[PDB]
Amino acid sequence: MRMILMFDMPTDTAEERKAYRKFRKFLLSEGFIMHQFSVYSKLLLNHTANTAMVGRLKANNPKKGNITILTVTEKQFARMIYLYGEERLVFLGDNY
Amino acid sequence: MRMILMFDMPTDTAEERKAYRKFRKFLLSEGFIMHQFSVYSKLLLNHTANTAMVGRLKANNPKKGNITILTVTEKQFARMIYLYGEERLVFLGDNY
Amino acid sequence: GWRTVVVNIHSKLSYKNNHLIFRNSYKTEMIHLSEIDILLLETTDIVLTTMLVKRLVDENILVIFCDDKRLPTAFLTPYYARHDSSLQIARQIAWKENVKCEVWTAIIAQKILNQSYYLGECSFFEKSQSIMELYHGLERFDPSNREGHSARIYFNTLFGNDFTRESDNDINAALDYGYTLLLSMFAREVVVCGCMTQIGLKHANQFNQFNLASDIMEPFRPIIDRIVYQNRHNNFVKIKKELFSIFSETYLYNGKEMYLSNIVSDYTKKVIKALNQLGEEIPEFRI
Amino acid sequence: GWRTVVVNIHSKLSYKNNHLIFRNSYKTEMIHLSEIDILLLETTDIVLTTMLVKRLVDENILVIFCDDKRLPTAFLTPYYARHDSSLQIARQIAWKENVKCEVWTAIIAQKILNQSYYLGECSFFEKSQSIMELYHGLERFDPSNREGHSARIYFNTLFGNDFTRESDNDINAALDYGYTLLLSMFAREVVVCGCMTQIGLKHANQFNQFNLASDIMEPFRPIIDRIVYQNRHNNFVKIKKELFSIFSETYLYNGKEMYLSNIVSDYTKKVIKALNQLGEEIPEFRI
Amino acid sequence: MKINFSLLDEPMEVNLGTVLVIEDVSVFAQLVKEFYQYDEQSNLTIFDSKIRSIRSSELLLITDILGYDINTSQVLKLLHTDIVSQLNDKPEVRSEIDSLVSLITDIIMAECIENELDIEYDEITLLELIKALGVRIETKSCTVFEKIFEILQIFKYLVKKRILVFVNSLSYFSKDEIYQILEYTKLSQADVLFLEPRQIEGIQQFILDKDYILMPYNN
Amino acid sequence: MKINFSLLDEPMEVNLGTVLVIEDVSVFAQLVKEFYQYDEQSNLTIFDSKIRSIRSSELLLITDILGYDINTSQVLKLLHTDIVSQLNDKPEVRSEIDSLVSLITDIIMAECIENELDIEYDEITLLELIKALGVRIETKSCTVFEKIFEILQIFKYLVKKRILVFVNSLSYFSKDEIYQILEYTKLSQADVLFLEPRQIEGIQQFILDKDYILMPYN
Amino acid sequence: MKINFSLLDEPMEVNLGTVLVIEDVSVFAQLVKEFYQYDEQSNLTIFDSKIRSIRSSELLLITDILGYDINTSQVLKLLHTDIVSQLNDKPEVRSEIDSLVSLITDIIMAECIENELDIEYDEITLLELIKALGVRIETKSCTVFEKIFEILQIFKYLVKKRILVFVNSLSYFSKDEIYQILEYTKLSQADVLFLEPRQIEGIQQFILDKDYILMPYNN
Ligand SMILES: [Ca+2]
């Protein structure tokens, strides 16, 4: 089960930034990889490790922190498209 | 097709904050809902609407903005779990 | 419009809310008309509506219709692009043979000079020196035919002595294809100017609707000759795709670096203004 | 080919087995390709196929597109094997000033004669006799301006002395509407002839782009002013409804009673053929 | 009752019976899938004169003619009510039935008085007599044509179904049977929409070409 | 397997995939009526390789592909019984399941004893665990081409059904999809028979003329 | 949408526009009284294809054309929603309007920041802009023909009205105007039933003779 995890929290206070660094280090220690800011994912072996990981994430969530969790297949994970910020020739048909 | 979208960008400058507000308003106008900061999702009817939405998101991405797109099933989109929040010496009081 | 839309697939096209509607069984896509410059139909299975054709005529978008072989068959020519056309017809009838032969001679000099620049970039000193000699030897009425000799020496030097323009090889086919596309864009620009396309600036005896647009498109041929020379080993399909990449690529005008469509539009505008004002300034395009 | 196929109704066009398939809600008709000569599309709801367009390119038949106003907008231009109309436009560029002045004077004489005859049908003998005197006094180059002098007499007789063409009223808007419909029909006929409508018969004013058709439609103008005189009390919408019945109404041509479309077609053909042949015969139309 | 999809230029109106022929197998299968999934997909939109979109519960979709169950609790209940109304429209027949049921009630009442226990009853009504008779429609021996005809007859009994749609049901019926189905649909006023891959000869229908052009066809 | 009716001269055999075209609308509609009424009517007969008549329970007749539910009470019963048999084939795994169920029953029993109200329980069984998990065949079908494939999978899974019959189901699929369906039928070895009003070009099929004569095609 | 009364032999169907001419003044006045009192009287019965009788709230009765109020809260609300949909169908116009509204909101926000009190706001939307503009239909200068045309245009906006009925409204309109009303009713799909004492020449209508015989009439 491919576990996609989004993480956010107000970063204004120094304690909030420290909690964000601690939570990020905890995510890296648990096997999660950061694709971009607030974007992470980890490959869970089965539903058991998934449930235990959900409990651990709920236990380690910092104050005011918010985590989104989504279950995704490998075919859907390879279809993940990341656009980081206008074509002259538009082709409708075979792309040649 | 359930589209999970993460959005990040340096917010330091005033122009960057204005661009972030504009991009967020554009995401809300397109049907995306914000589950938490940087975390959004939208239900796309089919693959064509998904491709057009990808092109539109690439066109509307602000400078230095970074977007992560992941495809999840509708049942897996409902499976989304949002969690909102080992020391030997525990101090309840002034932290010294 | 900035966008060249090419449809090689069977589908139905409609016009809805100032938007081009591409409807197919697999997917449907809407593209705004203001962004669209040129519309190219490369197959015979495409369907369109006369209302969308009227909206394309009002939007002044060039519509090209190809054959089953995908080679262009016929393009749409609007009767009235602008009200200044009816006033420009009297000026075209009032044009002088000295202005026509002068502007055409300067244009041929720009084409031969562009060929000498292409051979100079290709590091041929004798060929570019000979073509430059023919450029310095060009005269009014063209008694020496230095333009045809420059073309024969150009193609014979590039593709080999055994090569010829009358051959049926895919090289000449791609050359006629690029000349047909550039002739279509230049002809559409002449339709935007409003002047008669059938009246040429060189020979009054030759009667052809594409004569004027060819005389205006003469200096830009070496741009097609370059990609044709590089892709000559590739198949005709890949050569056609590389020819389609010319619209995406940008070229350096004397003023600044611009797109091909803008250079053709501004060049044709300066040519028409120079013809009506009797040679005030001659636009020069260099590679 | 011979027959001229015009589509005024919603329909779809296809090409099967060297046979043009025209499909309308009422019935389906199949026409051989060799029988068709010129193809014109009146409305914006017509659907066509690019394959039929390619077959038309091989058949050389001229394709004419029209807008919602029915005025012709664009026509199909093939890159090779061009139609004979493009060769016929050169004769229109060669039209002599004497033939243009003769045809123009004949047209003005026909219009003034129709106005005086209509005033005689309205039983005003003094105004019709004055307009007839101006008709017999018309001369080349128009130094007397007897047409502009007959105008005020005709309109002042019809709608009263207080009425004028410069004032803004439902009568003037109705006259411009009828002149717009007649300009659309005559302009469509001139587009069928292939001659450029920007070149006018009047040598003074080139401002209008329709000048040729606007000059050809003058002899049929009073037929609109009759219905506008009868319906003048009705609102502009009712005047438009009454003017819309002129297409269904039949009129008397010199040869036989015919519809307005065929009469305008024969008149335009005689005008073009007379201009190319330098005044063999001048078509005359009387109310 | 107008239906609209992305392939059509304008929404097409469905009045009485309507035969829609889709010459493209891809657009036909996609349209049928959009008919079964209609609540999930927004591509196919069916709206009434009020422009209000009808729910999938209001839409009636039928593919297998002999597999559909025509006998339901609501259909049999409303049918029994219709029979009770038919018997109520005739005063003489209702009077005779009242006499007979009254005699039976007298007999059963005497048998109850003969018993030692105290027994009470109310009445034997006509709806209870029909429910005891077990009146229902017979689809067992019915041919496909009679089955579709019975479906067109019970569509008036269905309250919640706004429109009836048949999928490829015209291949079984002969041209004359199709003429009877359409002519009966014009009298029943119900809205029926048939979807066929191939065009039927002799009947008015809307044809969708592989070019995605919709045209009316008399034959 | 072979099917026989009064119109045919000799019974035709149905092996792997088979396409049967009936050029008569009356014989086609009457044939479908004989398919739904097969239990009632003795006209249409089916003789297997053993030359024995089969009951209508062994015949699988499917007209609407999308309207046919894959999940049924009998299908879920046979699937749950199959999974229970697979878990019963391994003693150690079932023993571990009994241990875990014993632990959960001990926890819930302790929580029940903690409550002030008296509580009575029976036990937890593997069948109740499977039914509680909701084990069923996948209900996701994007197109009728995939739905018919699921119908072929469930048909090959069902041993009681000796034949699967489709009525006018080939009009939805494209010629290439028909080729893929025939190849999948030949790979699955199941017996499938199709009934079409008109002939299909490009594939092998048995054409029944209006003269009642049957002829092979391709 | 079939209507039935004791004088008719069979219930007559009303589809699109229908002109019903009653040649008897007694039956006409009694029928109009049964139209106003319809909830109280069981003589006149109007039912749909479901045979369900429509309530008087679902029936729309109109006699005075210029006295009827076309502007209502529901009609203006649904009309504003329709205008918002029309502005939403065009992306460019909606973008421009969003830009202008953004500028105005910036100005007002600056003015709020200049104040000493802490002020909060939300947004200025398109529906609020239309409500502030006061968009409504103008019946003041409208002719009777334009009034009935606007009524036929707003009948689609009325959700609860099942059928529109006009009482003696065809006397004011010319034959051509009646042709425009019927031809527009065929496009609007609404069900309109006109009641006139005298027959109108040139239009299809149902005539009820003093003999109480109902016959279709082409003219
Ligand atoms: Ca009872």
Ligand SMILES: [Ca+2]
């Ligand atoms: Ca019983």
Ligand SMILES: [Ca+2]
């Ligand atoms: Ca607000």
Ligand SMILES: [Ca+2]
């Ligand atoms: Ca206001």
